[PDB]
Write a protein that binds this ligand. Structure first.
Ligand SMILES: NS(=O)(=O)c1ccccc1F
Ligand SMILES: [Zn+2]
Length: 258
């Protein structure tokens, strides 16, 4: 049946239903740090999350999403490589069964334990569903997670995960401040790519921060207690929900920093 992360429905199979899997601007990629070019004309990112309104957290069977009210310019990303204003719609993570894997992007082939994606759509397209049909429709801010000290601003997410263990469960999730998930520095790499899951649409400006955040072993362990299945279906732990790096093809990764 449907796409997933198993042997039988995982990333090597996706191209049969989503032929853009083999396209010219797929994500994630390996970020070769020596080959990335500093682009002095890239602007600082502007992350404006002070008025963010989180609403709900949802296990969609592939990851969990913390969803936001995106019906006004409440949490926006601008600047950097972007033209215009991009509104935060949701964030989610990808993680591993082991601390040695889990990120989608890699840095000089290094895999991190997990990767956070803050997903934003270009307000010139009016809604997310129209934006994903455009080559500049989305901006995803990607942040690596390494295991060490706890991230105190992650704990409220971790603690609600027992309430959304299985596919299709949701829970109210108000007043969560996504600024507590960011590193100190906003230095980044950027390149044009895609959604990393089906439908794999080539609509994303990727902005990947150089500085990882640290999370504790106990925090990532709780992500690994989630289930891909629905309640009353056989239990399959939600782990290794990452797509491996895809060919860079005719793209250059730019760096905001030297
Ligand atoms: N992982 S990602 O590219 O941020 C993503 C965001 C939304 C839908 C599908 C996706 F794949
Ligand atoms: Zn993602």
């Amino acid at each position: 049946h449907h796409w997933g992360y198993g042997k039988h429905n995982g990333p090597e199979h996706w191209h049969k239903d989503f032929p853009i899997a083999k396209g010219e601007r797929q994500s994630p990629v390996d970020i070769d740090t020596h080959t990335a070019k500093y682009d002095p004309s890239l602007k600082p990112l502007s992350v404006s999350y002070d008025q963010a309104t989180s609403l709900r957290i949802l296990n969609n069977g592939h990851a969990f999403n913390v969803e936001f009210d995106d019906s006004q310019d409440k949490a926006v990303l601008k600047g950097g490589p972007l033209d215009g204003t991009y509104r935060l719609i949701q964030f989610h993570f990808h993680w591993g069964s082991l601390d040695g894997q889990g990120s989608e992007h890699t840095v000089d082939k290094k895999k991190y334990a997990a990767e956070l994606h803050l997903v934003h759509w270009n307000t010139k397209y009016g809604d997310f569903g129209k934006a994903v049909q455009q080559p500049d429709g989305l901006a995803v801010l990607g942040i690596f997670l390494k295991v060490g000290s706890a991230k105190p601003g992650l704990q409220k997410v971790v603690d609600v995960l027992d309430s959304i263990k299985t596919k299709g469960k949701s829970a109210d999730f108000t007043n969560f401040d996504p600024r507590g998930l960011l590193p100190e520095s906003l230095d980044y790499w950027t390149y044009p790519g895609s959604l990393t899951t089906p439908p794999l649409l080539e609509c994303v400006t990727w902005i990947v921060l150089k500085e990882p955040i640290s999370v504790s072993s106990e925090q990532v362990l709780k992500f690994r207690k989630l289930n891909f299945n629905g309640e009353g279906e056989p239990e399959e732990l939600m782990v290794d929900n990452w797509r491996p790096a895809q060919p860079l093809k005719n793209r250059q990764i730019k760096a905001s920093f030297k």
